[PDB]
Amino acid sequence: KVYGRCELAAAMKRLGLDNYRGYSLGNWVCAAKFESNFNTHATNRNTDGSTDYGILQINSRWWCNDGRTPGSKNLCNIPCSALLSSDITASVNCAKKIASGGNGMNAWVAWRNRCKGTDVHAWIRGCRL
């Protein structure tokens, strides 16, 4: 499902992400843009058998079970296809744990990269919030 910018910004404000771990909503926005381009079914396979899933592209090798990753975790109890739906609930639940750890949003590269030191603000400026 390809999301509006503000449709996606309204959503994870309700979902609770604004100022979560003292990251303000446009960080979230900008990581989803740059991570999926707001597509929930966006998927990328890796060099490890790994596959990142959904909208903030959570990795199969640490946070989910997709069916086949030649050894690892599931730090979230989610089957990777929950990442994959309409509904961001699950992506955003899992997302919180990844950012619960030490590095915070630095787990998303693209955020690290296209988003640290920016006007993330800019991602919600014209929004129905």
UniProtKB/Swiss-Prot annotation:
Its EC number is 3.2.1.17. One of its GO terms (biological process) is cell wall macromolecule catabolic process. It catalyses: Hydrolysis of (1->4)-beta-linkages between N-acetylmuramic acid and N-acetyl-D-glucosamine residues in a peptidoglycan and between N-acetyl-D-glucosamine residues in chitodextrins. Lysozymes have primarily a bacteriolytic function; those in tissues and body fluids are associated with the monocyte-macrophage system and enhance the activity of immunoagents. SMART domains: LYZ1. This is Lysozyme C. It is an enzyme of class 3 (hydrolase). Keywords: Antimicrobial, Bacteriolytic enzyme, Disulfide bond, Glycosidase, Hydrolase, Secreted, Signal. One of its GO terms (cellular component) is cytoplasm. Residues 1-129 form the C-type lysozyme domain. Its main location: secreted. Belongs to the glycosyl hydrolase 22 family. It is found in: Secreted. Monomer. Lysozyme C is capable of both hydrolysis and transglycosylation; it also shows a slight esterase activity. It acts rapidly on both peptide-substituted and unsubstituted peptidoglycan, and slowly on chitin oligosaccharides. Pfam families: Lys (PF00062). The keyword Secreted applies. It comes from Meleagris gallopavo. Disulfide bonds join C6-C127, C30-C115, C64-C80, C76-C94. The keyword Lipid metabolism does not apply. GO terms for molecular function: glycosaminoglycan binding; identical protein binding; lysozyme activity.
